[PDB]
Design a protein around this nucleic acid. Structure first.
Ligand SMILES: [Mg+2]
Ligand SMILES: [Mg+2]
Ligand SMILES: [Mg+2]
Ligand SMILES: [Mg+2]
Ligand SMILES: [Mg+2]
Ligand SMILES: [Mg+2]
Ligand SMILES: [Mg+2]
Ligand SMILES: [Mg+2]
Lengths: 275, 87
RNA sequence: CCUGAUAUUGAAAUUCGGCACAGCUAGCUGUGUUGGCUUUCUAACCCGCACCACUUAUCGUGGUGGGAGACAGUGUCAGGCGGGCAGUUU
RNA sequence: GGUCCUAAGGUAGCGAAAUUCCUUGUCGGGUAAGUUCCGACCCGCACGAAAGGCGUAACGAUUUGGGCACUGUCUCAACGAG
RNA sequence: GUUAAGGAACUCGGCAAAAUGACCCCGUAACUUCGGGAGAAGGGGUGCUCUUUAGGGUUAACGCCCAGAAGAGCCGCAGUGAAUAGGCCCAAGCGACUGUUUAUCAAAAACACAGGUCUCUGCUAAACCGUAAGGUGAUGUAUAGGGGCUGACGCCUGCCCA
RNA sequence: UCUACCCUUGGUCAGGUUGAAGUUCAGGUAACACUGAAUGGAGGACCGAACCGACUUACGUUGAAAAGUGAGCGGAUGAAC
RNA sequence: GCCGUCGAAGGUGGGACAAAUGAUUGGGGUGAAGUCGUAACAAGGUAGCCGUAUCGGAAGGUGCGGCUGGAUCACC
RNA sequence: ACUUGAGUGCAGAAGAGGAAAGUGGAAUUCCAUGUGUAGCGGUGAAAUGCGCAGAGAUAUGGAGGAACACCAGUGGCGAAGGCGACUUUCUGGUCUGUAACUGACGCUGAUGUGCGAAAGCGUGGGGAUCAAACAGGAUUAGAUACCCUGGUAGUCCACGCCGUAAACGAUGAGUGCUAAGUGUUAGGGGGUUUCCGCCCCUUAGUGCUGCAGCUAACGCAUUAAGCACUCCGCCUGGGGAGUA
RNA sequence: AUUAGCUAGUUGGUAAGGUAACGGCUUACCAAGGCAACGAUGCAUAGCCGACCUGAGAGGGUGAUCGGCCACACUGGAACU
């Protein structure tokens, strides 16, 4: 779980780490790594879009198979490694063709697993097979959205989904945010819940390791004089004085919905969100 | 639990005396074959406590048989400690 | 930004109202014409959807699929929010 | 307890405060002597619960009052060197 | 640079100076998040010469460098004898901390912060730059991303929807 | 080419000091298993130069310098330069 | 007569325990009941009581568990 | 050396004794459409409220979470707190009959240590019903009161704590002992074992009625509050006070 | 016992010195012990026995004159015959 710390310093007063007991073979595989230069919000004009980014520690992207091809070949699981680009851990499967690849690792996985559409396809944790071939009440993750595209929905650490039922051409999926939604019946799904479940209790504990992860400070609005934030200065501290708290570009940020009338999402979203 | 087709084997390798189903030797040997098997239930299950009252009960029974055995035989008391590992 | 009206924009339907009074007992029936709501099919259009060629380029165009489909994107017009921004008065 | 009215019409906790005009509030401690300081009272001109309320070990080239130590800052100045 | 007697009486204010300063020892309170407080405070000893003995490594060993104990003795006003090196204590106020700020009259009690919440986003995501193409968000996908307020930890956060 | 964040590739920090997790041995355990002694070398940790800053004060103010020198002062294995 | 070991009293400093005292301050018993309500003992008119929370001027009221030391007809 | 106490072996049953994992039925609430439509509720009386924008009634639908009708009774079990749908793997103790077995191996327990009904708290999930706090209508001279539709922390699970109650049989444990009748539950003794027929007995829990005895009285009375033995815990007028 | 730890020359050998003699009796190198829930250590109250008082006795309360023993001399040390 989480290994705690003892308050020898005011920095390490309440800091709490995440114990690396589910990591085997800590060195990577030197044929599936691709370089990853950073950018802090610097698009193809050099300007600054999205704020609060940049710096920290160098990384190196690790090529992940989200497609789950190579039908009907038994894949062992060798070693469970660490991945900095994302919240889950990672796996190193070996297909019997000697084609070593990476899989995002579900909850308990060391044994050896199968990808096949409908042969028997062996519904267990780690096996990917399309949603027409999955019985109901079955916790899946890493679903595709468009057929043959690649697994998109629910890829986090400790995330999941749930197949509810089967409609006339689609299936019916309950997502992690609590939003029932129709997905086409030939999208794949890994069966299981993705591992590394103790992730959101990692108390960072210090403004320095919240700072070498690629985060910069975020100055509040009411301390900017009114050239650049609609919560401008005033003498002393001040209540906001608007009918609605505003983002730094005029739009009200506290309450107003933002999505627009969109193609192939109104006829599919049955229930909305629950928050 | 231990069955009564395998409990009888526990007696035979601890027969310093001949044809005795109850001794300061043989039931103590049976109790250890349960303590080593109750305490492996009690390294998988922990919320129960009625077993952990039977666990406390059986050992203090042996601590009275062993303290009787200290006060009869000099080299049989020390043998039974050395034979199973139990103190 | 939001929302209508038409253009690109086609067929199949099923009901529901305004006329028209067509039957001639407030409401029935059923034809000639008008405006809708829906429902389904594919031929435009659309895909930051899969292999395949130009090519030993995750750009592009060309090609059988699979999705979505006369809605969306877009052009003209019209209404409503709009100190996010401008010109000035006090 | 009566009664007017408002959409209900200041709860726990703090209180002459970085918040109190009059005011140098008032009684206690500190000094030979204390408009500043510390502990209390509460009649809050006008504290108050995420423009957070009340406490707090550790940390400060922070701000305010009192002790020992040391001294030309001082009573009171004099001499010498570049 | 030094100074008789006195030592904050000076002054907006102990401002500038003066004292404390090294190593080796004995000893150390309230208070607390049990790590801290703590160099807490208050104290003692150090120089040179001579006699004995126990301590590593190097080496066949005389030889060489590293050291610590008691005892005996000598001299000066003074033995880290010159230069270099913390003053400390009691009680409050604001901010938890290290950090960062007005290049050149303001370094803070302001800004950040780790944590608490609230709301928006089902993926060609919302958001932002750009008339558009293209990009950032991300080769990430609700344990993840953009924004509003409060600012560790502890105990808590009361009524009103005209 | 100064400064403000920022991307890719390098460089630099004398020394000395406390002693976090763990691991091993011993003591008790066989109950609910926790005390000591060694070893290990943790940290926006403490004292201090280079190095980076600019708190108090005196001088300078037709300056030696359109922002500085004298005595002191803070950070110094990182949110560093 | 001088030198040295041991040595009361004195002076310096941080603590440890009781006692005397102190602006205000919180409950407690005492009376005499004037002030405000009836919470128990009859089924005391909402049956009481023991733990444990939360609210109110005032006894106290409600929630979740246990007890009869619970009338009627003892709640068949 | 002895075998009545205490322990095991073998022969046998009765269990809501625990702990993980599945699985099943009936009711409550909320979402989808119809037929349908002015009332549904609530009450000493009434409303506040939901409804006419189509509520309740009424059907299929599907979403959840929680308890576990009938058996169910005096029954059972665990040292207590307590434990009632079913199936599965793992897991303690008690009892009946005794051929066996070493041969007093005991009882009590100051500190220690481990389980503890509910409420409450900490960090995470999930939230139908009931529902402190809370707003509302009237009952009241006054009303959180009692009464009514609403309602959050909480209720359920996993982990770590706090340990109190009318935690009660208001009766501490251990051994032997002394008039008897009547039930009930799981076992053993005498029958052709008549099957829930029967009486005849012996042992262990479980309730009722009742001598001698003891008691202030009530009432216990073989499961003693009787006669004795051992060891432990506590009390010494009522408040002040389980407070400082 | 609403006080649980306590002494450090403290516990012991050894050495020579030291008083009528034994002696941590006072000093020196080594050695790891003393005491303790059977009350060790620390506070407030006290001269103590033979006897006096009361009591059916067992016990409770007392310590004066009278005898035995003990300590002290306005206060705190140290000696000499
Ligand atoms: Mg303007
Ligand atoms: Mg200091
Ligand atoms: Mg201090
Ligand atoms: Mg775009
Ligand atoms: Mg500089
Ligand atoms: Mg600067
Ligand atoms: Mg009970
Ligand atoms: Mg509970």
């Amino acid at each position: 779980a989480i290994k705690k710390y003892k308050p020898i310093t005011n920095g390490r007063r309440n800091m709490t780490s995440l114990d690396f007991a589910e990591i085997t073979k800590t060195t990577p595989e030197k044929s599936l790594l691709k370089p990853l230069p950073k950018k802090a919000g610097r698009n193809n004009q050099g300007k600054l879009t999205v704020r609060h980014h940049g710096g920290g520690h160098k990384r190196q992207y690790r090529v992940i198979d989200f497609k789950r091809n190579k039908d009907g070949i038994n894949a062992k699981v060798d070693s469970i490694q660490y991945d900095p680009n994302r919240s889950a851990n990672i796996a190193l499967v070996v297909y019997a063709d000697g084609e070593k690849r990476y899989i995002i690792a579900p909850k308990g996985l060391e044994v050896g697993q199968i990808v096949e559409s409908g042969a028997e396809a062996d519904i267990k944790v780690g096996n990917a097979l399309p949603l027409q071939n999955i019985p109901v009440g079955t916790v899946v993750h890493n679903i595709e959205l468009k057929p043959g595209k690649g697994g998109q929905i629910a890829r986090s650490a400790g995330a999941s989904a749930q197949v509810l039922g089967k409609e006339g051409k689609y299936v019916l999926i309950r997502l992690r945010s609590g939003e029932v939604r129709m997905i086409l019946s030939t999208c794949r799904a890994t069966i299981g819940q993705v591992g590394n479940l103790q992730h959101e209790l990692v108390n960072v504990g210090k403004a320095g390791r919240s700072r070498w992860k690629g985060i910069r400070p975020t100055v509040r609005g009411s301390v900017m004089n009114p050239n650049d934030h609609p919560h401008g200065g005033g003498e002393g501290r001040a209540p906001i004085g608007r009918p609605s708290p505003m983002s730094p570009w005029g739009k009200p940020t506290l309450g107003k919905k933002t999505r627009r009338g969109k193609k192939s999402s109104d006829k599919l979203i049955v229930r909305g969100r629950k928050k | 639990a231990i069955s009564q087709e395998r409990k009888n084997e526990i007696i035979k390798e601890y027969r310093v005396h001949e044809t005795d189903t109850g001794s300061p030797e043989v039931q103590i040997a049976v109790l250890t074959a349960e303590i080593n098997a109750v305490n492996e239930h009690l390294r998988t299950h922990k919320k129960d406590h009625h077993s952990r009252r039977g666990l406390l009960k059986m050992v203090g029974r042996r601590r009275h048989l062993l303290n009787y055995l200290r006060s009869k035989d000099i080299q049989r008391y020390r043998e039974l400690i050395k034979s199973l590992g139990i103190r």
